[PDB]
């Protein structure tokens, strides 16, 4: 619903001859998806990594603490892929990352 | 390229043409190490460790039995060339371990 409202506002701005960046600000979200997060870790963009303790098959995340330690990224193992899925509007999430937040946070 | 002699036999035999140099075909890049592949392989080696036959060859190389290590590596892997490359790789692992210690 939020994305639909944002796209309606951007369509209105395009209709009145304005760029979508004029009516939309830079977003700040929890980063998720295992391939995406591994890319962010390798590019050293991730500031904090949270890994679910119960990923099956375990090989999908078994290298993640070593990768984070090599890149100097703070990580923590947390209980609940379902709990991380509640963060990212999914049933489950293997890993979440924070790259950047707002100034008040 | 060496110019051909224009003769049917001998060294550098064959009809004379103007040989061109070619930009190398991208299919011939296979075997080259890329940075990401090297990084991922080093991390996976650190995570997974060694195989038991690799531990045996490392023990032989530490004790200095190089010919025994080569023979055992050939028996384990199958060919002399693969055994030689594996022994060089494990000697490198030993050298980095010693330079760390």
């Amino acid at each position: 619903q939020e994305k639909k409202e944002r796209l309606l506002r951007e369509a209105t701005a395009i209709k009145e001859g304005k760029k979508k960046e004029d009516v939309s600000k830079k977003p700040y979200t929890v980063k998720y998806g295992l391939n995406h997060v591994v890319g962010l870790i390798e590019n050293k963009k991730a500031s904090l990594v949270l890994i679910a303790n119960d990923v099956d098959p375990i090989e999908l995340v078994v290298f993640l603490p070593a990768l984070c330690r090599k890149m100097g990224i703070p990580y923590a193992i947390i209980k609940g892929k379902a709990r991380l899925g509640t963060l990212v509007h999914k049933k489950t999430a293997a890993v979440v990352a924070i790259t950047e937040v707002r100034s008040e946070d | 390229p060496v110019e051909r002699t224009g003769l049917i036999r001998g060294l550098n035999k064959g009809h004379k043409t103007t040989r061109r140099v070619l930009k190398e075909r991208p299919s011939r890049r296979k075997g080259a190490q890329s940075k990401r592949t090297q990084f991922v392989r080093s991390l996976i080696r650190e995570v997974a460790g060694l195989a038991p036959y690799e531990r045996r060859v490392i023990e032989l190389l530490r004790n200095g039995k190089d010919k025994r290590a080569r023979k055992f590596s050939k028996k384990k892997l199958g060919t002399f060339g693969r055994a030689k490359r594996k022994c060089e790789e494990l000697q490198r692992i030993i050298a980095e371990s010693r330079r760390a210690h």
Binding site: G39, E42, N43, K44 | K35, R36, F39
Partner: peptide, 8 residues
């Protein structure tokens, strides 16, 4: 940092 490719 480790990059898969150059990015825009």
């Amino acid at each position: 940092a480790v990059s898969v490719r150059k990015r825009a």
